[PDB]
Structure formats: structure tokens, C-alpha cells
Amino acid sequence: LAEHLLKPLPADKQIETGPFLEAVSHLPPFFDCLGSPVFTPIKADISGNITKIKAVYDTNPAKFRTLQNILEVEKEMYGAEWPKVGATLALMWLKRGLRFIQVFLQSICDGERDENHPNLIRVNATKAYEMALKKYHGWIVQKIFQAALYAAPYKSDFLKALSKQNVTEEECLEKIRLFLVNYTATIDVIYEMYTQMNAELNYKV
Ligand SMILES: CCCCCCCC
């Protein structure tokens, strides 16, 4: 996990597309080791969005050098259908996926738990869901999240799984905190970009 840290933000806060996609491409495979096929569709959504942005990038790497480039070029390229189109739309959903991972991990690292059920991660996943995803989900997808939530492993097993290995829980969390530095900064920059370009949409699914 700290074998594939995201690069720090450069001074101009512009995120290079290629290295960003390479970096986040290492996240989806962590879903295979949560212990349930319930996560298979979840992995597909994130992967699918990464693939969709990569494919737009591959048509003109120079034109789409940065993520900013993607949003502004597609704004010009598409007119009225933007921002509900192309790599812009893919990245709008990707960022929420990544933000969910961010809030989930930070909650774990911050020692947030249910005093009553302390070896579960339901409260952490629930907060992540509320902050990142829930307001863009209709009632049906929300009830599906609630069902999917029980496929969550214990905190102990999830952390041991991320050590895929000879290492204490405290060591593992410190590596995760390290990862979260440039991850969070990068995700924040992307959310800021959607706000400044007025590319953020609020429709539910
Ligand atoms: C460099 C990005 C490659 C696309 C990977 C798709 C999702 C894992």
C-alpha cells in the first residue's frame, strides 16, 4: 500500500493524468481480499471508471496531460452534454469512490469505533458512505449498501489482510496514515477542481 504512494502535489496543484491513473490502479485489487463476492461489482465500478479515463487519455496524452486538461478540453469538445459525459463523468464517480476509501481508512486510523462492537468496521464504513456516496444514491442502492455492509470483515482481519506481512497492527496503521497524506491532498484537489469548473452534478442513481 505504501509501495504505491501517490506523488505529492506540485506547486501549481495540477495533477498529471498518467501517473495518477497508474497510482490508483493499485487500489481495486485490494477488494479481492475483503473476503466476499459482494465487492466484485464495487471493484468493477472503480476499475471501470479508471479504464474510461485511461482510454480518453490514450487518444491524446498531451492534450489530456493533467486532470484539469481533461475537464476543460471536454467542456469545449462536448458543449451542452458536459459535464455528464466522457472522462469528466467517469472521474466524477471515481473521486467519490476514492473519497470513500479515504474517509474509511482515516476513520480506522483515527481510532473511531463502536464501543459496543469494537472489532467491527461498520461505523467506519458507514461514515465513509455518508460523506462520500449516500447523497447520490436512491433508496434502493442505499438498502443494498446496508446489506453489503455485513460482508465487511472484522477490523483485525482487514488490517492483517492489508499486510499481505510480518508486522504489528500499529505498524500497519502508521503505513496507512503515510499513504493517506498525498492521497487525501490529491483527492481534495480533484474535488476543488470539480467545484471551480462547476462540473459537479448531484443526480442520484
Ligand atoms: C494506468 C491505468 C490503467 C487502467 C487500469 C484499469 C483499472 C484497474
From Swiss-Prot:
Effect of W93F: Partial inactivation; 63% residual activity
Region annotation (2 X 12 AA approximate tandem repeats) ranges: 42-63
Listed GO MF terms: ceramide 1-phosphate binding; ceramide 1-phosphate transfer activity; glycolipid binding; glycolipid transfer activity; identical protein binding; lipid binding; lipid transfer activity
UniProt: beta-D-galactosyl-(1->4)-beta-D-glucosyl-(1<->1)-N-[(9Z)-octadecenoyl]-sphing-4-enine binding residues: D45, I46, S47, G48, N49, I50, T51, K52, H137, Y203
Stated consequence of mutating I42N: 18% decrease in activity
Alphabetical GO biological process terms: ceramide transport; intermembrane lipid transfer; response to immobilization stress
Main location as per UniProt: cytoplasm
Pfam family name, one: GLTP
UniProt xrefs under InterPro entries: GLTP_sf (IPR036497), Glycolipid_transfer_prot_dom (IPR014830)
Keyword Cytoplasm annotated: yes
Effect upon mutating K52I: No loss of activity; 90-97% residual activity
Subunit structure as annotated in this protein's UniProt entry: Monomer.
Protein name from the UniProt record: Glycolipid transfer protein
Gene: GLTP
